[PDB]
C-alpha cells in the first residue's frame, strides 16, 4: 500500500508532515489534521493547496487528493472555510482559537481591512490571551512585540496595543479570544471571500463570497448585494459566472447578471465556492 508524504501549513505556522495512501480521499487528510488539532468542529474548515496558476484551491475531501494537486506537490495549508457569523455559537472554544488565528492572518495579510483602533483592539485582545495580563517589566516606554497585528506595523499601533492591553487585567485566554472575535465578526470584509471579475461591459468589480449572500464591489459609491434567497441559479461556462436573481413579487421573470472570469479554472473556482457557502449558510 503506496503512501505519500503530505505536509501541512498549520495556522501557528508550524508544518505538520504525515502520509495517506497515493489514492486517499481529502477527507483522509484532513481527519488526520483535525485529530493533530484536537478539533471536533471541523465543518468551519478546510485545506488549501497553491496550484499551477499559482492559486487556491479548496482540497475536495470528497475526491482523490492526486486528483486534484495532479502535478504540484502535496502541500497544504490548514484554513478556515465558513466563518460563523456568531462565533459565540460554536460549541469549543478550541474552535474560537483557531478561528482567531485564521482572522489574525487576514488583518496581517490585508485581506481583512480594519480601522487603526480595531487593529490595536484585536492586538490588545490577542496579547492578553497569549502572555495573560500587562508587566510593565517586559513593556519599556519603546516596546515593540513579537506579534504581527497589521499589514503595517507603526509605533503608535504598538503603544495603542498596550495602552488596552492594560485594560484587560484578569482576562482568562477564552474570554479575549471571545472579545477578539465578537469584534473582528463585524467588520465589512469578515469571511468575505474575493474574486476578480468584469462585468456584462468589461469593467472591473470584485465578487465577494460570505455566509449571507454574494457582493458585487463596482465603484464603492455602488456595491450590489444578493442574499442567499435571491439568489436563484448559480451557473459557469467557459470563463463566464452567471447570476440568476428571483424577481421582486408581481415580476414575472428573474434579472441575469453576467461576469468574465480571467479564465475557466477562475469561473469554476467562484462557482463551487458560492454553491458550498450557499449550502452551508441554508442549513445554518
Ligand atoms: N438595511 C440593510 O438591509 C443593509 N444590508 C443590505 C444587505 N446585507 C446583507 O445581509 C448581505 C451581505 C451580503 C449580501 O447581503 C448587508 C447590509
Same mark, same amino acid.
Given at each position: 500500500?503506496?503512501? @505519500?508524504?503530505?505536509?501541512?501549513?498549520?495556522?501557528?505556522?508550524?508544518? %505538520?508532515?504525515?502520509?495517506?495512501?497515493?489514492?486517499?480521499?481529502?477527507?483522509?487528510?484532513?481527519?488526520?489534521?483535525?485529530?493533530?488539532?484536537?478539533?471536533?468542529?471541523?465543518?468551519?474548515?478546510?485545506?488549501?493547496?497553491? &496550484?499551477?496558476?499559482?492559486?487556491? *484551491?479548496?482540497?475536495?475531501?470528497? +475526491?482523490?487528493?492526486?486528483?486534484?494537486?495532479?502535478?504540484?506537490?502535496?502541500?497544504?495549508?490548514? *484554513?478556515?472555510?465558513?466563518?460563523?457569523?456568531?462565533?459565540?455559537? #460554536?460549541?469549543? &472554544?478550541?474552535?474560537? %482559537?483557531?478561528?482567531?488565528?485564521?482572522?489574525?492572518?487576514?488583518?496581517?495579510?490585508?485581506?481583512?481591512?480594519?480601522?487603526?483602533? !480595531?487593529?490595536? #483592539? /484585536?492586538?490588545?485582545? !490577542?496579547?492578553? =490571551?497569549?502572555?495573560?495580563?500587562? $508587566?510593565? &517589566?517586559?513593556?519599556?516606554? &519603546?516596546?515593540?512585540?513579537?506579534?504581527?497585528?497589521?499589514?503595517?506595523? !507603526?509605533?503608535?499601533?504598538?503603544?495603542?496595543?498596550?495602552?488596552?492591553? +492594560?485594560?484587560?487585567?484578569? @482576562?482568562?485566554?477564552?474570554?479575549?479570544? @471571545?472579545?477578539? /472575535?465578537?469584534?473582528?465578526?463585524?467588520?465589512?470584509?469578515?469571511?468575505?471571500?474575493?474574486?476578480?471579475?468584469?462585468?456584462?461591459?468589461?469593467?472591473?468589480?470584485?465578487?465577494?463570497?460570505?455566509? =449571507?449572500?454574494? /457582493?458585487? %464591489?463596482? $465603484?464603492?459609491?455602488?456595491?450590489?448585494?444578493?442574499?442567499?434567497?435571491?439568489?436563484?441559479?448559480?451557473? %459557469?461556462?467557459? *470563463?463566464?459566472?452567471?447570476?440568476?436573481?428571483?424577481?421582486?413579487?408581481?415580476?414575472?421573470?428573474?434579472? !441575469?447578471?453576467?461576469?468574465? #472570469?480571467?479564465?475557466?479554472?477562475?469561473?469554476?473556482?467562484?462557482?463551487?465556492?458560492?454553491?458550498?457557502?450557499?449550502?452551508?449558510?441554508? /442549513? #445554518?
Amino acid at each position: 500500500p503506496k503512501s @505519500m508524504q503530505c505536509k501541512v501549513i498549520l495556522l501557528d505556522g508550524s508544518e %505538520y508532515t504525515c502520509d495517506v495512501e497515493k489514492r486517499s480521499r481529502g477527507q483522509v487528510l484532513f481527519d488526520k489534521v483535525c485529530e493533530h488539532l484536537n478539533l471536533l468542529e471541523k465543518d468551519y474548515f478546510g485545506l488549501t493547496y497553491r &496550484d499551477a496558476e499559482n492559486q487556491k *484551491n479548496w482540497l475536495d475531501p470528497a +475526491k482523490e487528493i492526486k486528483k486534484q494537486v495532479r502535478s504540484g506537490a502535496w502541500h497544504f495549508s490548514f *484554513n478556515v472555510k465558513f466563518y460563523p457569523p456568531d462565533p459565540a455559537q #460554536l460549541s469549543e &472554544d478550541i474552535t474560537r %482559537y483557531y478561528l482567531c488565528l485564521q482572522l489574525r492572518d487576514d488583518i496581517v495579510s490585508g485581506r481583512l481591512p480594519c480601522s487603526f483602533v !480595531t487593529l490595536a #483592539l /484585536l492586538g490588545s485582545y !490577542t496579547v492578553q =490571551s497569549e502572555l495573560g495580563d500587562y $508587566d510593565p &517589566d517586559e513593556c519599556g516606554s &519603546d516596546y515593540i512585540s513579537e506579534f504581527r497585528f497589521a499589514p503595517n506595523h !507603526t509605533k503608535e499601533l504598538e503603544d495603542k496595543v498596550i495602552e488596552l492591553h +492594560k485594560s484587560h487585567r484578569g @482576562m482568562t485566554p477564552a474570554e479575549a479570544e @471571545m472579545h477578539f /472575535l465578537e469584534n473582528a465578526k463585524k467588520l465589512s470584509m469578515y469571511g468575505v471571500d474575493l474574486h476578480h471579475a468584469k462585468d456584462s461591459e468589461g469593467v472591473e468589480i470584485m465578487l465577494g463570497v460570505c455566509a =449571507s449572500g454574494l /457582493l458585487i %464591489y463596482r $465603484d464603492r459609491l455602488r456595491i450590489n448585494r444578493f442574499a442567499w434567497p435571491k439568489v436563484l441559479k448559480i451557473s %459557469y461556462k467557459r *470563463n463566464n459566472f452567471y447570476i440568476k436573481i428571483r424577481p421582486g413579487e408581481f415580476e414575472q421573470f428573474e434579472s !441575469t447578471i453576467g461576469f468574465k #472570469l480571467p479564465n475557466h479554472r477562475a469561473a469554476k473556482r467562484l462557482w463551487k465556492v458560492c454553491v458550498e457557502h450557499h449550502t452551508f449558510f441554508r /442549513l #445554518l
